[PDB]
Amino acid sequence: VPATRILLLVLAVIIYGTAGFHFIEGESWTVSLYWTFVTIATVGYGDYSPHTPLGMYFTCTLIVLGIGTFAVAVERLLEFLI
Amino acid sequence: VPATRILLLVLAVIIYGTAGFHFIEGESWTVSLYWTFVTIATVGYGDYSPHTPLGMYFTCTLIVLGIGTFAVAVERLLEFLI
Amino acid sequence: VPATRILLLVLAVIIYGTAGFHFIEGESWTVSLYWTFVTIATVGYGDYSPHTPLGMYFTCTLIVLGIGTFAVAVERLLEFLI
Amino acid sequence: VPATRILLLVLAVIIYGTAGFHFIEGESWTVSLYWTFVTIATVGYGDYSPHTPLGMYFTCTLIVLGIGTFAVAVERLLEFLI
Ligand code: NA
Ligand code: NA
Numbered sequence: 598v599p600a601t602r603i604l605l606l607v608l609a610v611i612i613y614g615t616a617g618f619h620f621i622e623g624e625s626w627t628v629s630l631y632w633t634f635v636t637i638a639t640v641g642y643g644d645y646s647p648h649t650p651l652g653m654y655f656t657c658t659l660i661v662l663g664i665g666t667f668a669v670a671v672e673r674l675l676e677f678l679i
Numbered sequence: 680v681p682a683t684r685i686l687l688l689v690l691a692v693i694i695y696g697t698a699g700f701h702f703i704e705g706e707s708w709t710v711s712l713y714w715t716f717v718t719i720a721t722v723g724y725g726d727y728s729p730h731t732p733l734g735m736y737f738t739c740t741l742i743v744l745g746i747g748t749f750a751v752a753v754e755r756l757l758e759f760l761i
Numbered sequence: 762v763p764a765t766r767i768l769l770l771v772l773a774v775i776i777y778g779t780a781g782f783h784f785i786e787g788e789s790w791t792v793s794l795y796w797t798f799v800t801i802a803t804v805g806y807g808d809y810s811p812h813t814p815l816g817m818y819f820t821c822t823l824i825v826l827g828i829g830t831f832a833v834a835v836e837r838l839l840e841f842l843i
Numbered sequence: 844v845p846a847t848r849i850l851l852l853v854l855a856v857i858i859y860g861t862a863g864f865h866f867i868e869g870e871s872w873t874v875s876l877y878w879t880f881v882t883i884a885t886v887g888y889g890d891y892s893p894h895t896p897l898g899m900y901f902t903c904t905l906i907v908l909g910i911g912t913f914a915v916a917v918e919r920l921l922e923f924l925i
């Protein structure tokens with residue numbers, strides 16, 4: 598699967614995660630984007646996290662949808678530049 | 680090993696982790712499920728975590744039982760859909 | 762490299778991490794063991810973390826020594842049982 | 844790609860992350876180094892994290908630049924010594 602296709606999937610995941618967190622949890626766009634990266638990279642600082650049942654479910658789906666996508670994208674990125 | 684077999688193993692891990700956290704730590708079913716995903720994906724926000732010696736041991740076993748299972752499942756999921 | 766050799770390396774890493782955290786940071790043996798697993802699996806809840814400069818350095822070495830060892834051990838464990 | 848080349852890339856990532864966190868977030872050099880390792884290993888305790896919009900953006904770039912680099916370095920390190 599081409600690296601650029603994976604990148605597009607990662608972009609869609611970022612949109613999904615950011616919009617989801619902002620509207621379900623009510624955080625700013627900037628915090629939501631930052632939380633999305635932190636979550637899909639599996640860093641998970643816990644400075645931000647869902648506080649509602651829907652936010653928690655949503656976060657599980659994001660984890661399922663995003664962690665593999667992101668992992669493959671970074672390693673393809675690594676190959677590409679190096 | 681077939682992707683669906685791995686999925687079943689991941690499901691059993693989720694049951695194990697959720698029930699374990701709920702009964703050992705006393706959190707709600709919903710929090711326990713969410714904590715299980717967050718732990719086996721290695722996100723680990725720390726909004727929830729074990730507060731007893733048995734919960735801590737249990738979490739170590741979950742980590743050992745769940746992180747590999749979950750990693751293989753997501754990457755097999757990725758292959759399957761893409 | 763044989764799976765059992767890797768297991769022994771993981772055991773040594775666990776001893777290293779546990780003893781280190783207990784004596785440098787002053788946490789209980791049980792907390793230190795739990796923190797070691799949580800760190801080398803990269804879960805990192807942040808319920809426990811080093812609060813001194815030596816603890817922070819030590820944690821960086823543990824991260825370097827432990828995360829690869831642990832990752833290979835779990836995947837070898839997965840292959841072995843499945 | 845030679846292991847030593849990867850090591851150099853990891854070193855540059857560490858400089859990038861440490862200096863960035865220290866100057867953008869204002870933490871000590873020691874905390875910033877420790878935070879950099881904790882972030883690029885994806886441990887993410889959350890004892891330290893960015894509190895400004897620029898720090899959050901910067902952390903996303905560090906995550907993108909550092910997690911793949913670091914993962915490949917540790918596994919190459921593992922092969923080399925074992
Ligand atoms: Na974390
Ligand atoms: Na945390």
Ligand code: NA
Pocket residue numbers: 638639640720721722802803804884885886
């Ligand atoms: Na992680």
Ligand code: NA
Pocket residue numbers: 639640641721722723803804805885886887
């Ligand atoms: Na983590």
